Short mmCIF file of C-alpha atoms in Angstrom, two decimals:
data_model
loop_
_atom_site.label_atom_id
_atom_site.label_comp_id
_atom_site.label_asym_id
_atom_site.label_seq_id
_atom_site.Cartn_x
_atom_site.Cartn_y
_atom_site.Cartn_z
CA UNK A 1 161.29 135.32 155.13
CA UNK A 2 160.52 137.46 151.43
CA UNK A 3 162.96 140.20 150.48
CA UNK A 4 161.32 143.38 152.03
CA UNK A 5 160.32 144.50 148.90
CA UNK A 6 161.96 147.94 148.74
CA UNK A 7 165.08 145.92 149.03
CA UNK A 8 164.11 144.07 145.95
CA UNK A 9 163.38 147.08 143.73
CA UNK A 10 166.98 148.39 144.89
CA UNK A 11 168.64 145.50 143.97
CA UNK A 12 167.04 145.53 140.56
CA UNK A 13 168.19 148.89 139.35
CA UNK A 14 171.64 148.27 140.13
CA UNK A 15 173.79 148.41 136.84
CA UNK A 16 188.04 150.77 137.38
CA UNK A 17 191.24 151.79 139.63
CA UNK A 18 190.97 152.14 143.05
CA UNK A 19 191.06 156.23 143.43
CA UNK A 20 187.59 155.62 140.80
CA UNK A 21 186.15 152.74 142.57
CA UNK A 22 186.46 155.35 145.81
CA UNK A 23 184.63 157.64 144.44
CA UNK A 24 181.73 155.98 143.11
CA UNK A 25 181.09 154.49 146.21
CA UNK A 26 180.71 157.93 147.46
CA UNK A 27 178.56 158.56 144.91
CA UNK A 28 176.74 156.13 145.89
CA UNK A 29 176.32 156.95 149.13
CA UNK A 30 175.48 161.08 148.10
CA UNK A 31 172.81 160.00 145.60
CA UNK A 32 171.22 158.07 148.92
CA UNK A 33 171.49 161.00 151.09
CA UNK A 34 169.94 163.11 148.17
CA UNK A 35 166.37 160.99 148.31
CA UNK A 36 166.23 160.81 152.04
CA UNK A 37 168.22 164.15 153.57
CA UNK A 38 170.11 163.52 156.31
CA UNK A 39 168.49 165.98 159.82
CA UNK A 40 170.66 168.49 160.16
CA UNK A 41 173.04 168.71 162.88
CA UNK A 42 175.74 170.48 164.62
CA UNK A 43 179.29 169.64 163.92
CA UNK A 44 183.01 170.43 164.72
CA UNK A 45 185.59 168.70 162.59
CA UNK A 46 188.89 167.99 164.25
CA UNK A 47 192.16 165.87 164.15
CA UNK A 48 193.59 163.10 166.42
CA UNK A 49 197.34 162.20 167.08
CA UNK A 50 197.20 158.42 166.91
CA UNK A 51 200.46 156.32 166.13
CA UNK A 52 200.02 155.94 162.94
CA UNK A 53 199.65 159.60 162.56
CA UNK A 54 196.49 162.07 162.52
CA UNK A 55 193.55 161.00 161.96
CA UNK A 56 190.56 163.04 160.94
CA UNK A 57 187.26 163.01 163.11
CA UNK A 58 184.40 164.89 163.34
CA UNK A 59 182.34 165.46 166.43
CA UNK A 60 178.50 165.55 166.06
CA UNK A 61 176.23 167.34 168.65
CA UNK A 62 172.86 166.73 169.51
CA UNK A 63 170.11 169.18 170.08
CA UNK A 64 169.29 167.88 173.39
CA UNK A 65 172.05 165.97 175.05
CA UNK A 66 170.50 162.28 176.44
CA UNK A 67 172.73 159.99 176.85
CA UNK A 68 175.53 160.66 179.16
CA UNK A 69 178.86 158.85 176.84
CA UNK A 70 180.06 159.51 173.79
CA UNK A 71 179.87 157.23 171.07
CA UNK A 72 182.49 156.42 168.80
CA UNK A 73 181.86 155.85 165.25
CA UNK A 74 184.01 153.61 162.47
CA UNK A 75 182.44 153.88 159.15
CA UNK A 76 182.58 150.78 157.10
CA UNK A 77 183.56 150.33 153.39
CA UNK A 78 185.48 146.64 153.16
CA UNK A 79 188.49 148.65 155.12
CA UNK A 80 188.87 150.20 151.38
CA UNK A 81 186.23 152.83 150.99
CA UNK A 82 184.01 155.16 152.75
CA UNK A 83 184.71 158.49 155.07
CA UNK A 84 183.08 160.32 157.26
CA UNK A 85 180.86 161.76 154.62
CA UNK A 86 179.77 158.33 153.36
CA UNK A 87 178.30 157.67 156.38
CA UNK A 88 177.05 160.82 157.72
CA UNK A 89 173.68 160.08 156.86
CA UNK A 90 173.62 157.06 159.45
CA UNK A 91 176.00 159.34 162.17
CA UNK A 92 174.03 162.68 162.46
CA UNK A 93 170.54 160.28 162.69
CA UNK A 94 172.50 158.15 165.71
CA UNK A 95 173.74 161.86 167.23
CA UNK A 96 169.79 163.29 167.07
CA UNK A 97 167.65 159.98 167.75
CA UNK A 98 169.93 158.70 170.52
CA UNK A 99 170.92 162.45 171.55
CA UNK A 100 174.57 161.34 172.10
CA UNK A 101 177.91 163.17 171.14
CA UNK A 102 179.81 160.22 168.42
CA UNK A 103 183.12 160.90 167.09
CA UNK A 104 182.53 159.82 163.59
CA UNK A 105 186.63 158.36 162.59
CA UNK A 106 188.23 159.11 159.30
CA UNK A 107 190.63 155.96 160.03
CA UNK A 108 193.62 154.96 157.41
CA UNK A 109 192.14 153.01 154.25
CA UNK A 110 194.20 149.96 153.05
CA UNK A 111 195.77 149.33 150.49
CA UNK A 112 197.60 152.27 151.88
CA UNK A 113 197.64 151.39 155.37
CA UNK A 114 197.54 147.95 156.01
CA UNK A 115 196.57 145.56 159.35
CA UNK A 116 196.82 146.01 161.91
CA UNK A 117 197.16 150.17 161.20
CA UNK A 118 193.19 151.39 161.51
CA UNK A 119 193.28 149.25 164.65
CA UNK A 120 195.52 151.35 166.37
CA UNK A 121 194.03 154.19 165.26
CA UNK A 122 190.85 153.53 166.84
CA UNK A 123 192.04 152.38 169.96
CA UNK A 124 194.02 155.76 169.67
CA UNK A 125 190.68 158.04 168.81
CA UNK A 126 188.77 155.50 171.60
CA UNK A 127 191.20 156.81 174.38
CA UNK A 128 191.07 160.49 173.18
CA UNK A 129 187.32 160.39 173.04
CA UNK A 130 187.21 158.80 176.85
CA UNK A 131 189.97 161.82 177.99
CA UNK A 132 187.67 164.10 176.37
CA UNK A 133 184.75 163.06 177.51
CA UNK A 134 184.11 164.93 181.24
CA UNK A 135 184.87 168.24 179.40
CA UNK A 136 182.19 167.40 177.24
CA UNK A 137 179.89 166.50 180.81
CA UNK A 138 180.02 163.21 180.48
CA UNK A 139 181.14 160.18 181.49
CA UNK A 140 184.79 158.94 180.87
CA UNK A 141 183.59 155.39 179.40
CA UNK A 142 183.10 155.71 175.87
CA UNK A 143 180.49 153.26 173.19
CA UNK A 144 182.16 151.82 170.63
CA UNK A 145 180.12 151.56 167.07
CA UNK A 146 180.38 150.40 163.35
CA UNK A 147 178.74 148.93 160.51
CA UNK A 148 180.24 146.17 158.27
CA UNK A 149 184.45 146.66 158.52
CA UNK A 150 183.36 149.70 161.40
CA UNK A 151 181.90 146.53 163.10
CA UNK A 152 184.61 144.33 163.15
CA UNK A 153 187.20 147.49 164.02
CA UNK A 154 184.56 148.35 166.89
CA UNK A 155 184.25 144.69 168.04
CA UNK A 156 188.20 144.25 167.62
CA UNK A 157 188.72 147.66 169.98
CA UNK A 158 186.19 146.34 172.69
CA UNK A 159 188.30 142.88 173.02
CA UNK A 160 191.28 145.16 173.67
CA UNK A 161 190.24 147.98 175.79
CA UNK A 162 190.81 146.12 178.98
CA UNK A 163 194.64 145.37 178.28
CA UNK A 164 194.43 149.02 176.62
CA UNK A 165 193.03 150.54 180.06
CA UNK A 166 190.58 152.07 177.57
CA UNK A 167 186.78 152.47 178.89
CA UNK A 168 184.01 150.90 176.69
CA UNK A 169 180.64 151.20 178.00
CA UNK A 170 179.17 149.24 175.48
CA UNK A 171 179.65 148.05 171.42
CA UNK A 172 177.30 148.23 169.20
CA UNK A 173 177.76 145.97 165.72
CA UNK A 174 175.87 146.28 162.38
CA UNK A 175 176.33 143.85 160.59
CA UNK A 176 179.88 143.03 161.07
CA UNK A 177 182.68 141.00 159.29
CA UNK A 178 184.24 139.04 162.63
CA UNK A 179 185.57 135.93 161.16
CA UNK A 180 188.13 135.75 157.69
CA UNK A 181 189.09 132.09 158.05
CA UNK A 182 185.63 130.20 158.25
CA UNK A 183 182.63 129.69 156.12
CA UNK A 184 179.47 129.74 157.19
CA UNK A 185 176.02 128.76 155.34
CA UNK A 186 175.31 132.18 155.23
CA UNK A 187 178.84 133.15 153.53
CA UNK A 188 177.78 130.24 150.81
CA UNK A 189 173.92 130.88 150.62
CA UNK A 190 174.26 134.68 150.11
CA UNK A 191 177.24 134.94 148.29
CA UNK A 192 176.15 136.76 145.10
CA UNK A 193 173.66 139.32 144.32
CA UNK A 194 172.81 140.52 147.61
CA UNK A 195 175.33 144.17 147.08
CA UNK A 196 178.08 142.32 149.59
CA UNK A 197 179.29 139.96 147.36
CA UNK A 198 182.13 137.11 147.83
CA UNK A 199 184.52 138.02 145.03
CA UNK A 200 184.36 141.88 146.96
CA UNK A 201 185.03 140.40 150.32
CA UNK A 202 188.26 138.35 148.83
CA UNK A 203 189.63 141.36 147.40
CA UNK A 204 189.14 143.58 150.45
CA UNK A 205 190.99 140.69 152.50
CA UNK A 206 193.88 141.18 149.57
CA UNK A 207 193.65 145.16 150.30
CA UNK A 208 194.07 145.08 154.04
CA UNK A 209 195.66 142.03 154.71
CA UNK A 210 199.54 141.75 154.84
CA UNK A 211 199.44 138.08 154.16
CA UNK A 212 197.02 135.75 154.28
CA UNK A 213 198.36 134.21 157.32
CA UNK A 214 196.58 137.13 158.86
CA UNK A 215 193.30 135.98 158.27
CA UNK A 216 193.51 133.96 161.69
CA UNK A 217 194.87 136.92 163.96
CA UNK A 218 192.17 138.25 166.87
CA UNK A 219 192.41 141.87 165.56
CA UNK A 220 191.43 140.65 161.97
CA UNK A 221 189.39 137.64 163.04
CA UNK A 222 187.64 138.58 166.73
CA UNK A 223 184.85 136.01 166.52
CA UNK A 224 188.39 133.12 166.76
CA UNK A 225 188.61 134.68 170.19
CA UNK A 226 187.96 131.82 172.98
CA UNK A 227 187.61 134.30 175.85
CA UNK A 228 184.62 136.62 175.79
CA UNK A 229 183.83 136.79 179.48
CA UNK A 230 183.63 140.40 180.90
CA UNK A 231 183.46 142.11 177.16
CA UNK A 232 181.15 145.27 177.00
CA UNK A 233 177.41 144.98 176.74
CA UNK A 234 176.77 144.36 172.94
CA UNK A 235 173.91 145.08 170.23
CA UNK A 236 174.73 143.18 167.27
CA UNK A 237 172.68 143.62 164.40
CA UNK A 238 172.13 141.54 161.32
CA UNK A 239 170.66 141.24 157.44
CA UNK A 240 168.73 138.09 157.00
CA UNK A 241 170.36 138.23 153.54
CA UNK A 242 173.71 139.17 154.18
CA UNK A 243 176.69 136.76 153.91
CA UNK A 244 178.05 137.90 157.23
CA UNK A 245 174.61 137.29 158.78
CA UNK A 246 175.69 134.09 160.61
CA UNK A 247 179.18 134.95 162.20
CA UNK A 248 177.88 138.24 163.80
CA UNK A 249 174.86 135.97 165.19
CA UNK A 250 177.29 132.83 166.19
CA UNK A 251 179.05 135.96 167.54
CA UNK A 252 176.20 137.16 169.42
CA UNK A 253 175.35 133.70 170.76
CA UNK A 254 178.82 133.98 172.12
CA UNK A 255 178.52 136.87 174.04
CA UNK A 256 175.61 136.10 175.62
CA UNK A 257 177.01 132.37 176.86
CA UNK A 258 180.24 134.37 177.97
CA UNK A 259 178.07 136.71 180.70
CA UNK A 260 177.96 139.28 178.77
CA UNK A 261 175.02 141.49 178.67
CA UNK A 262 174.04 141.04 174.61
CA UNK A 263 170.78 142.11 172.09
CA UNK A 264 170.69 140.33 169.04
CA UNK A 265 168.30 141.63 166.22
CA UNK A 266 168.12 140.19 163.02
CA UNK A 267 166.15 142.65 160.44
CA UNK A 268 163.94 140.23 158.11
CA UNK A 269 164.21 140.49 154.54
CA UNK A 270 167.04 143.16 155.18
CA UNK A 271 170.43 143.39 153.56
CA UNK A 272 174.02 144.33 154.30
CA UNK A 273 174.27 147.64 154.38
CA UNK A 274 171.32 148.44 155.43
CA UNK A 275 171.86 150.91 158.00
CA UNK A 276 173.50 153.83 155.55
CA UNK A 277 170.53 153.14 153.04
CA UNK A 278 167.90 155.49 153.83
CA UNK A 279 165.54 154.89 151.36
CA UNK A 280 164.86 152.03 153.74
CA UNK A 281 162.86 152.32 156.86
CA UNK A 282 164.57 149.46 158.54
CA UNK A 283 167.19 152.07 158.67
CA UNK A 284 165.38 154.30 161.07
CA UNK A 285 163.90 151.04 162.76
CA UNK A 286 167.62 149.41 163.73
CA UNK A 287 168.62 153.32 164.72
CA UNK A 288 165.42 153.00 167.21
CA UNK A 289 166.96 149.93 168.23
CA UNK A 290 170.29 151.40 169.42
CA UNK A 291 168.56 154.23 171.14
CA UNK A 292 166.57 151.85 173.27
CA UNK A 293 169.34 149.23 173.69
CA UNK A 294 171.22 152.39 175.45
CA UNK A 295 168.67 153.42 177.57
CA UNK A 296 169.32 150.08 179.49
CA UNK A 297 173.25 150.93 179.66
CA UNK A 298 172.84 153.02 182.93
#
C-alpha cells in the first residue's frame, strides 16, 4: 500500500550525549503537541513505591467517566527516552475519547536502570493501580497499555500478572518491540528511513540490556513465550512500514490461536510511532480503535 502521504512529507523534513539526545526527543515530541494541542484534561500527579524505588505517575481524569477500569499507561522511547510529558498528547486523548482513568508511568530509563528494573516497576504501579481502583468506583482489574518499548513492558506485565496475582482486564499494544533475538522481513525490509531505524534499535538493546544473553529472556523477548493460553484480551496495533510490524502481528496471530480473545489492526501506509504523532489522523483513528475494542471488554 503507498505511504499515506502526510507520512511522506514528515519523513522528508527530517534533518550528541545521552542527557542531549533526551532532550531533543522531547523536543520533538513538544513541537508535535504545539501543531495539534493536546484536549485539555484533568490531572493529579503522584508517586508509587515500587522495588526499585518511586516511581512517578500521573493520573488523568475524564470528563465523563465510561469505562469502568483504569488503564495503565507505559510510554515508549527505545526504554531510553520519553516521560510522561512525551506522551501526554496520546494519554489525555485515550483518558477523554475512551473516558477512562490511565495512570500514565514515569518508569526507570536505562542506561541507568537496566533489565529487568522498569519491569518490576510496572508490575509494581499495575498492582497499585488495581488496589486503587474501587476507591476510584471501579473495578479492581486494571488494562494494561503502551506504544513501542510501553508495548513490549505492557505485553511483558500481562504474561506475568497471573503468577503476580495482578488483575489485567485486557492489553492493548501499539506497535510493540516483542522479539530481540529474531529477524523478520519486516525488521530487514524497513530497516532504514522509516524514523525507527535498525542501528537505533541495536543501541537501545546495548542501553537496557545487561548482556546480550538477555535478548532471549520472556521479560525482554515475550513473543519467545510458548504458552499464551488464558492471556488478557489483546488489541495489537501495527505500522505497515514499521520494522516491528511483523512480530507484533506473528504476535497477534498467536494470541488468537492460543484462545485468547485478540483485534489485530494494521494502519496502511502508517509508521512507527504513529500514535504520539498528531499531525496524523491515523492517530485519532487507532485511538477510536481502542475505545471501541473496550466497549466489547464487559
Amino acid at each position: 500500500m503507498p505511504l499515506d502521504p502526510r507520512v511522506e512529507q514528515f519523513l522528508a523534513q527530517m534533518p550528541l550525549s545521552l542527557a542531549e539526545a533526551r532532550q531533543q526527543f522531547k523536543q520533538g515530541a513538544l513541537l508535535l503537541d504545539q501543531m495539534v494541542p493536546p484536549p485539555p484534561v484533568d490531572t493529579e500527579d503522584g508517586t508509587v513505591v515500587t522495588t526499585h524505588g518511586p516511581v512517578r505517575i500521573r493520573r488523568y481524569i475524564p470528563d465523563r467517566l465510561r469505562f469502568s477500569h483504569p488503564l495503565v499507561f507505559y510510554h515508549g522511547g527505545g526504554f531510553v527516552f520519553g516521560d510522561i510529558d512525551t506522551h501526554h498528547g496520546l494519554v489525555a486523548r485515550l483518558c477523554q475519547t475512551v473516558g477512562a482513568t490511565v495512570i500514565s508511568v514515569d518508569y526507570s530509563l536505562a542506561p541507568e536502570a537496566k533489565f529487568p528494573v522498569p519491569v518490576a516497576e510496572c508490575i509494581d504501579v499495575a498492582r497499585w493501580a488495581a488496589h486503587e481502583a474501587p476507591g476510584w468506583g471501579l473495578k479492581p482489574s486494571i488494562v494494561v497499555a503502551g506504544d513501542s518499548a510501553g508495548g513490549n513492558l505492557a505485553a511483558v506485565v500481562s504474561q506475568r500478572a497471573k503468577d503476580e496475582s495482578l488483575p489485567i482486564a485486557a492489553q492493548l499494544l501499539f506497535y510493540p518491540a516483542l522479539d530481540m533475538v529474531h529477524e523478520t522481513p519486516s525488521k530487514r525490509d524497513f530497516a532504514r528511513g522509516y524514523l525507527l531505524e535498525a542501528d537505533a534499535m541495536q543501541w537501545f538493546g546495548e542501553q537496557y540490556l545487561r548482556t546480550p544473553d538477555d535478548v532471549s529472556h520472556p521479560w525482554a523477548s515475550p513473543a519467545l513465550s510458548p504458552d499464551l493460553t488464558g492471556l488478557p484480551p489483546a488489541l495489537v496495533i501495527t505500522a505497515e512500514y514499521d520494522p516491528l510490524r511483523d512480530e507484533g502481528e506473528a504476535y497477534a496471530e498467536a494470541l488468537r490461536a492460543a484462545g485468547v480473545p485478540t483485534e489485530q489492526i494494521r494502519f496502511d501506509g502508517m509508521i512507527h510511532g504513529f500514535m504520539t504523532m498528531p499531525i496524523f489522523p491515523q492517530m485519532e483513528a487507532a485511538i477510536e480503535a481502542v475505545a471501541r475494542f473496550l466497549e466489547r471488554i464487559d
